[PDB]
Structure 1
Amino acid sequence: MKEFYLTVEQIGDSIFERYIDSNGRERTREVEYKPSLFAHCPESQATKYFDIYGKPCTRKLFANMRDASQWIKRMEDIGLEALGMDDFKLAYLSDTYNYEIKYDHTKIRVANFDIEVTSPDGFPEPSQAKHPIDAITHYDSIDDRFYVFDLLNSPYGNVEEWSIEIAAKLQEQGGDEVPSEIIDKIIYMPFDNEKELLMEYLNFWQQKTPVILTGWNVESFAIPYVYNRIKNIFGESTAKRLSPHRKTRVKVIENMYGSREIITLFGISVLDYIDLYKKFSFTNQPSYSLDYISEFELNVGKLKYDGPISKLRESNHQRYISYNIIAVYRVLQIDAKRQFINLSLDMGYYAKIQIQSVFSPIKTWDAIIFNSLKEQNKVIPQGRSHPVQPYPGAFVKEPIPNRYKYVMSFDLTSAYPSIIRQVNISPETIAGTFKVAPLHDYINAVAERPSDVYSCSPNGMMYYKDRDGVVPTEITKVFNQRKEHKGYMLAAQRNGEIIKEALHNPNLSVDEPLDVDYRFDFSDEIKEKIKKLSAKSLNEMLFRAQRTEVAGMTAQINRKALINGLAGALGNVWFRYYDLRNATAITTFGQMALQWIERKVNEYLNEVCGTEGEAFVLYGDTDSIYVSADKIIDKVGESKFRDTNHWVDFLDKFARERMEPAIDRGFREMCEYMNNKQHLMFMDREAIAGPPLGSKGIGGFWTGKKRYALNVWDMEGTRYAEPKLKIMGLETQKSSTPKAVQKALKECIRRMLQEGEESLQEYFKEFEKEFRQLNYISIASVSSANNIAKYDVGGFPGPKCPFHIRGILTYNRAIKGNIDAPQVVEGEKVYVLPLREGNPFGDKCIAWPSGTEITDLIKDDVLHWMDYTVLLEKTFIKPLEGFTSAAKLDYEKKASLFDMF
């Protein structure tokens, strides 16, 4: 097999590399790597190295890495550019792995771990590590085993061994319900004292040294706690054994307000799953406790126990250990679904970076572009300092607030990357500038043609047409990967809809789910077999189809994010290729493209309808248009349609055979106008939306920019078994809106779009009547909580104190004197409830940590004093009034002359 790296580090003048050799074995080596950097040289000096602008360079070979770094400093002192890759480990990987890396994940040691620490005096701070580590569960991907280290004797209690037999039993048998599929994979090790536990853990770690290290909050809690606890008991040298090279660094992570410390373990790649989830999931959750996320992702019930976690070990050690094990398994289950580890490895090896660098698109693209340029003997420019400067972004059309009955939407495939490719936007393809006219002059095609030689953006920039820039070249490669995975995702989605239809008529039989590849549209033979299957088999197939769709989603959406991140990075001062000329070239072209195509679509539709000046495009944001299809339907007449699916077919055909060719013609003209390198503006139909045929549903509505709802029958070629709501911006989509309120608002919208005014009125009346019965957590608002200390004046709200911070201050007064009560953590999320006048808490609201029950000390009082009237008005009635007034509809029945009977 071809060799591949596992980890790489610079330690002084040495590269430390862990890698898989050609026989599939893990090895470690120290290499005295001699880096090269570059300086500009005279034209007369023969060379094969050139900078990205074609200026010749001399290569400078250094005796060591320190000499290279010192040379960079002196070049700054002199005032001359020091060219080349200044991150020497990236240069090392580029030299050592000069080929597309093919990796074998089965050879990569992926460790998932979690620790328990009993603490009687509050949260056990990792920087202090003053309490014993009393449990570690460490899953190893190569062994496929859960290694359990269990402390039986502690100053906080002596306990009996954990029982695997009780652990396996149902909760109803008094067991812990540790999943049967992992029972045989547990290796249980009890210990008489903490010193022996930790010494054995370190010996185990030496034998099975993680390459990828993950878990939940491991970077912020488990790793620093373990490091500091070992450091406190044994000293620094022993704690450094967590690093295969015995090197660690306390790393200070800084943000807008305050900073925190993590421990860098040289030769390990830490990918904290909470951070993977936050970057790659595209959710925004009210809470990030493992319980909360596991319930959301897997539909598993919360791990239930009695009393505080600080007393769980002494009261129920059995459950304490089982829950530690299950917690590790839950992360593995989430990854089996979301496949974020697989993604990180794919992207990391593609870029040739430390795997943990996948969190940084700037680092990722720096590596990709460096490797690409190096292939041609080209030399990357030195990074420079730039002041942060604002620049313009996208155009968003102001919609007329209204109901919109029939709607078809269209948007550009990978808009900004497509613009980069079309225009040929790259640091080294800049050809010059032209005299800019107002944007509307380009939009309306009255401005003079920018260039007869170069490819242009309406911000004034001109680009070479003879050759592709490195940015277009590399962005295309990742775009092509994205396209492949999106294909699999959409096929799985379409396959899912087939199964859902079949589920209307399940067969009374005993059978098996079909062995199929859900990434490809089901053949006719598979469809016929599906129509004969039982509900059990069909539901298992639906589950598998949906898991395939999720896998495709992860792969495609994060590749989309990477290429969009390149366009964004051009506007970040820390990017080697930062250039506001290029950043603005993209965004300004985008504004033109949207408004240009709005004009073209309006022109086309006025032509087919025989009208003048009519606005068919009702809305657009960045790269999208929403087209009113009422007149198209009305030209045929609703009476002529057999059912809903019939008019959906008709609009689908109209979009594909009439609209898209017209859009394409419009964009081809624009490409010629701007003299672009290649026509790549592909604006495909997204949604077909409308009310069910013969209903009183309104179909859709807009309240304003970035705020709308559509009843969708077909999305990017997926024809739904049941209509699906596309809701954007509205409160149903905001993590701040209470859970039960999101649900109620969604049903209100569903009724508006599908059933009509009278149906909406019936539901409103019932919700208003019953909502006080809802569980307090389900009706609590949510907010991130920053700057608690800033607004805290002697425990009371200072000037301009935000509402949610006021709530936290209220909470803090109510729990004062308790070391056991949960503390609100700066920067994390809180639930928030309004309080009625004259409550014992002395203020108008209270807040507590999200994803948790409020502490028993105050729960009963909070419940008694909760202001249901304010809650309802703020979270439900106000947004609903917004929806209904926009839609020209009433949520309460108005009086009429009929009432007199």
Structure 2
Amino acid sequence: MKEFYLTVEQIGDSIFERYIDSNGRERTREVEYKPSLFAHCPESQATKYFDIYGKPCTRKLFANMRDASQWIKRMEDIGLEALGMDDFKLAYLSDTYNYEIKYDHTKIRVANFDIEVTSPDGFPEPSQAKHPIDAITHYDSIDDRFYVFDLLNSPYGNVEEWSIEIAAKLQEQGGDEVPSEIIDKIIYMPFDNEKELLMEYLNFWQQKTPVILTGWNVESFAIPYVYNRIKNIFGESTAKRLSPHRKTRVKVIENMYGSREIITLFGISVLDYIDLYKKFSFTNQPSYSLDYISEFELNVGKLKYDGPISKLRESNHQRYISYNIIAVYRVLQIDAKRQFINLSLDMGYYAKIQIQSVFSPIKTWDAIIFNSLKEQNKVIPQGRSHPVQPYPGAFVKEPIPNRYKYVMSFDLTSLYPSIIRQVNISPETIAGTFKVAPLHDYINAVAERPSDVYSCSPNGMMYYKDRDGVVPTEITKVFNQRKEHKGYMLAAQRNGEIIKEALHNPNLSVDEPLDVDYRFDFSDEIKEKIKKLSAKSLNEMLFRAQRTEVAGMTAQINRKALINGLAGALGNVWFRYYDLRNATAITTFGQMALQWIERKVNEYLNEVCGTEGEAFVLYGDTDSIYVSADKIIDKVGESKFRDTNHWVDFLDKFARERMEPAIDRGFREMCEYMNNKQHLMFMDREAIAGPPLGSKGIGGFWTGKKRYALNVWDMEGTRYAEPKLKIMGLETQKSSTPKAVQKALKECIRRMLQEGEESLQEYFKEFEKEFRQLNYISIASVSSANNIAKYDVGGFPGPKCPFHIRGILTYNRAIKGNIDAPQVVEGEKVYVLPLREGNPFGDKCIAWPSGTEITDLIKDDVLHWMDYTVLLEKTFIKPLEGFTSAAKLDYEKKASLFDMF
């Protein structure tokens, strides 16, 4: 097999590399790598190395990496550019793996672990590590085993061995319900003392050294705790055995308001799953506790136990260990669904970076571009310092707030990367500038044509047309990957809808789910078989289809994020290729493209309708337009349609056969006007929206920019079994909105769009009547909590204290003198509830850690004093008033002359 790296590090003048050799074995080597860097040289000096601008360079080969680094410093002292890849391990990988890396995941040791630490005096600080580690569960992907290290004797209590038999039993049998599918994969090791546990853990680690190390909060808690605890008991040298090269570093992570420490383990790639989830999931969650996320992702119930976690080991060691094991498994289950480890491996090996560098789009692109240029013997420029400067972004149209009955939307494919490719925007393709007119002059095609030679953006930039820049070349490769995965995602989605339709008529039989590839549209044969399947088999196929869609989503949306990240990186001062001329060339072109096509679409539809100056485009944001289709429907007449699907088909046909060719013509003209390299503005129909045929539903409404709701029948070619609400920006979509209120507001919107005013009024009256029965957590607002200390003046709110911070201060006074009470953590999220006048907490609100029940000794008081009236007005009535006033609708029935009867 072809060899591939596992990890790479620079330690002084050595590269330490772990890799898989040609026989599939894991090996380690130390290489005295001699790096090369570059200086510009005279034209008269023959060379094969040229910088990205075609200027000749001489290669300087250094005796060692320290010499190269020192040379860079002296070049800065002299005032001359030191060219080349200054991150020597990236150059090492580029030299050692000079081919497309083919990796085998089955050879990569992926470790998932979780520790338990009993602490009687609050949160066990990892930097102090003053309490015994009393459980470790460590799952190894190569062995496919859960290794459980269980401390039986502690200063906080001596316990009996954990029982695998009780663990397996149902909770209704007094068991822990450790899933049957992992029971046979548990290797249980009890220990008489903590020293023996840790020494054995280190020996085990030495034998089965993680390449990828993950878990939940492992980077911020488990790893620093283990390192520091071992350091405290045994000394530094023993603690450093967590690194295969025996090198570690305390790394200070700084943010806007403070800093924290993590432990860098040289020769390991830590991908904390909480951070993978935050980067790759495109959710914003009210809580990031593993129980919360597990419930959300997997629909598994919260791990239930009695009493505080600090007393769980002594009271119920059996459950304590079982829950530690289950916690490790839950992360594996989330990964089986979301496939973020797979994604990280894919991207990391593609870029030829340390796998953990996938968190950095700048590092990822630096390596991709470096490797690409190196293939041509080209030499990358030195990174430079730049002052942070604001720059303009997208255009967003101001909508007229209203109901909008029939709506068809259109959206440009991968806009910013398509602009880069079309215009040919790259550091080395800049050709010069032209004299800019106001943007509206380009939008209306009245400005002078920018160039007859070069490809242009309306920000004034011109670009070469003779050859693709490296940025366009490399962005295209990843775009093509993204496109393939999006195809699989949408097929799985369409396949899901076929199964949903079939589920209306399940067969009374005993059968099996069909063995099918959900990434491809179901054949006629598969469709016929599906229509004969039981509900049991259909539901299993639906689950599998949806899992396939999720896998496709992960792969596509994050490749989209990477390519959009390249466009963004051009506006980040830390990027080697930072250039506001290029960043603004993209964003300004986008503003033109949107408003240009708004004009073209209005012109086309006014022509087909025989009108003049009417606005068919009601809204647009960045690269999308929303077109009022009322007049199109009315031209045939609603009476002519058999059912909802009939007019959806009609609009689908109209969009594809009439509107898209008109849009294409408009963009081809724009390409000519800007003299671009290649026409790549591809705007396709996205949504078809409207009320159900014959209903009083309003179809859709806008309240303002980035705030709208549509009743969608078809999305990008997926024809839904049931209409789907596309709600953007409204409170139903905000993690800050109480859970039960999101739900209520969504139903109000559903009724508005699908059923009409009277239905909305019926629901509102009921919610208002019953909402005080809702669980307090379900009606609590959510907020991130920053700068608690800034606004804390002797335990009371300082000037300008935010509402949620005031709530935290209230909580802090209420729990004062309790080392056991859950502390609000700076930077994390809180639930917030308003309090009625004259409450014993002495303020108008209280807040506590999100994803948790408020502590028992104040819970009863919070419940008694919760201000339901304020809660309803602020979170429910105010947003609903916004929706209905925009839609020109009343949520309460207005008095009429009929009331006389």
Alpha-carbon offset, residue 313 of structure 1: 0.1
CA shift digits 1:745-770 (9 cap, x unpaired): 00000000000000000000000000
- Where does residue 591 of structure 2 map in the other structure? 591
Q: Equivalent residue of 2:127, what SS?
A: coil
Secondary structure of the residue that 1:399 maps to in structure 2? coil
Corresponding residue of 1:283: 283
Aligned match of 1:789 = 789
Note the 1:440-519 alignment, pairs <5 A: 440-519=440-519
Deviation readout 1:455-481 (Å, 9 max, x if unpaired): 000000000000000000000000000
In 1, Cα distance between equivalents of 2:654 and 2:678: 27
Q: 1:282 Cα deviation (Å)?
A: 0.2
Aligned-pair CA distance for 1:229: 0.1
Post-superposition Cα deviations, 1:539-589, rounded to whole Å, max 9, x if no partner, equal 000000000000000000000000000000000000000000000000000
Deviations 1:479-499 (A, max 9, x none): 000000000000000000000
- Counterpart CA distance in 1 for 2:826 and 2:392 is 33
Give the Cα separation in 2 of the matches to 1:703 and 1:461: 37
Deviation at 1:292, TM superposition (A): 0.1
| Deviation of the 1:195 alpha carbon | 0.1
| Structure 1 residue matching 2:448: 3-state secondary structure | coil
What do residues 146-184 of structure 1 show as CA deviations (whole Å, max 9, x unaligned)? 000000000000000000000000000000000000000
SS in 1 for 2:746: helix
C-alpha displacement at 1:505, in angstroms? 0.2
CA distance in 2, matches of 1:358, 1:863: 45
Cα distance in 2 between the residues matched to 1:549 and 1:622: 26
Shift of residue 710, structure 1, vs aligned partner = 0.1
1:181-232 CA distance string (max 9 Å, x none): 0000000000000000000000000000000000000000000000000000
Q: Deviations over 1:765-798 (max 9, x none)?
A: 0000000000000000000000000000000000
Query: What residue is the counterpart of 2:819 in the other structure?
Result: 819
State the TM-score, normalizing by the size of structure 1.
1.00
SS at match of 2:261: strand
1:121 and 1:388 mapped to 2: Cα distance?
Answer: 44
* Distance in 2 separating the partners of 1:792 and 1:877: 32
Residue in 1 that maps onto 2:84:
84
2:845 and 2:866 map into 1 onto residues whose CA distance is 9
Q: Using the alignment, how far apart are the partners of 2:775 and 2:77 within structure 1?
A: 66
Deviation at 1:603, TM superposition (A): 0.1
* Corresponding residue of 2:146: 146
Cα deviation per residue 1:707-753 (whole Å; 9 max; x = unaligned)?
00000000000000000000000000000000000000000000000
Give CA deviations for 1:633-668 in whole Å, capped at 9, x if unaligned: 000000000000000000000000000000000000
Distance 1:818 1:717 in 2: 58
Distance 2:622 2:193 in 1: 62
Q: Deviations over 1:794-845 (max 9, x none)?
A: 0000000000000000000000000000000000000000000000000000
Partner SS, residue 778 of structure 1: helix
Q: Deviations over 1:227-268 (max 9, x none)?
A: 000000000000000000000000000000000000000000
1:865 shift after superposition: 0.1
Secondary structure of 1:777's partner?
Answer: helix
Q: Secondary structure at the match of 2:679?
A: coil
Determine the C-alpha separation between the residues in 2 that align with 1:531 and 1:431.
61
**Cα separation, 2, equivalents of 1:481 and 1:645:** 34
Q: CA deviation at 1:312?
A: 0.1
Q: What is the root-mean-square deviation of aligned Cα atoms in Å?
A: 0.2
Structure-2 separation of matches of 1:684 and 1:353: 36
User: Secondary structure of 2:777's match?
Assistant: coil
Looking at structure 2, the residues matched to 320 and 588 of structure 1 have their Cα atoms a distance apart, in angstroms, of 57
| Distance across 1 between alignment mates of 2:781 and 2:295 | 19
Structure 1 runs of 4+ aligned residues shifted over 3 Å read none
2:63 corresponds in structure 1 to 63
Shift in Å at residue 857 of structure 1? 1.0
**How far apart in 2 are the matches of 1:455 and 1:150?**
67
* Inter-partner Cα distance in structure 1 for 2:807 and 2:480: 49
Residues 1:647 and 2:670 aligned together: no
**Normalising by structure 2, what TM-score?**
1.00
The structural deviation recorded for 1:67 is 0.0
CA drift of 1:130 comes to: 0.1
Mapped partners of 2:238, 2:877: distance in 1: 61
Task: Name the CA distance, whole Å, in 2 between partners of 1:2 and 1:203.
Answer: 31
SS at match of 1:257: coil
CA distance in 2, matches of 1:836, 1:222: 41
Q: What is the CA–CA distance in structure 2 between the aligned matches of 1:684 and 1:780, rounded to whole Å?
A: 41
1:664-720 deviation digits (Å, cap 9, x = unpaired): 000000000000000000000000000000000000000000000000000000000
Number of the residue aligned with 1:262? 262
SS at match of 1:839: coil
Deviation string, structure 1 residues 80-127 (Cα, Å, up to 9, x no partner): 000000000000000000000000000000000000000000000000
Deviations along 1:600-631, one digit per CA (max 9) or x if unpaired, are 00000000000000000000000000000000
Q: Give per-residue Cα distances to partners, 1:500-521, cap 9 Å, x unaligned.
A: 0000000000000000000000
Alignment of 1:798 onto 2:801: no
Mapped to 1, the partners of 2:392 and 2:208 lie a distance apart of 51
Residue in 1 aligned with 2:850? 850
Distance 2:704 2:152 in 1: 62
Residues 852-893 of structure 1, C-alpha deviations (whole Å, 9 max, x = no match): 000001000000000000000000000000000000000000
C-alpha distance in structure 1 between counterparts of 2:258 and 2:524, whole Å: 61
Distance 1:684 1:277 in 2: 31
**Cα distance in structure 2, aligned partners of 1:762 and 1:445:** 52
Q: Tell me, what secondary structure is at the counterpart of 2:504?
A: coil
Please list, as runs of the form range in 1=range in 2, the aligned pairs for 1:38-187 lying within 5 A after superposition: 38-187=38-187
CA shift digits 1:393-423 (9 cap, x unpaired): 0000000000000000001000000000000
Q: C-alpha offsets along residues 348-389 of structure 1, whole Å, 9 cap, x if unaligned? A: 000000000000000000000000000000000000000000
Q: In structure 2, how many angstroms separate the alpha carbons of the residues matched to 1:9 and 1:807?
A: 46
| Distance (Å, rounded) in 2 between the aligned partners of 1:873 and 1:40 | 68
Instruction: State the alpha-carbon separation in 1 of the partners of residues 364 and 258 from structure 2.
Output: 27
Question: Counterparts of 2:61 and 2:507 in 1: how far apart (Å)?
Answer: 74
2-structure distance, mates of 1:73, 1:469: 30
Within-5 A mapping of 1:278-677: 278-677=278-677
Q: CA deviation at 1:27?
A: 0.0
How far does residue 48 in structure 1 lie from its aligned partner after superposition? 0.1
Secondary structure in 2 matching 1:770 = helix
In 2, distance between residues paired with 1:778 and 1:572? 40
Unaligned runs of 5+ in 2: none
Unaligned runs of 5+ in 1: none
Structure 2 Cα separation of the partners of residues 729 and 176 of structure 1: 41
Residues of 2 paired with 1:735 and 1:172: CA distance?
A: 34
Distance (whole Å) between structure 1 residues aligned to residue 395 and residue 566 of structure 2: 20
User: How far apart, in 2, do the equivalents of 1:52 and 1:684 lie?
Assistant: 36
Q: Distance in 1 between matches of 2:416 and 2:631?
A: 32
SS in 1 for 2:286: coil
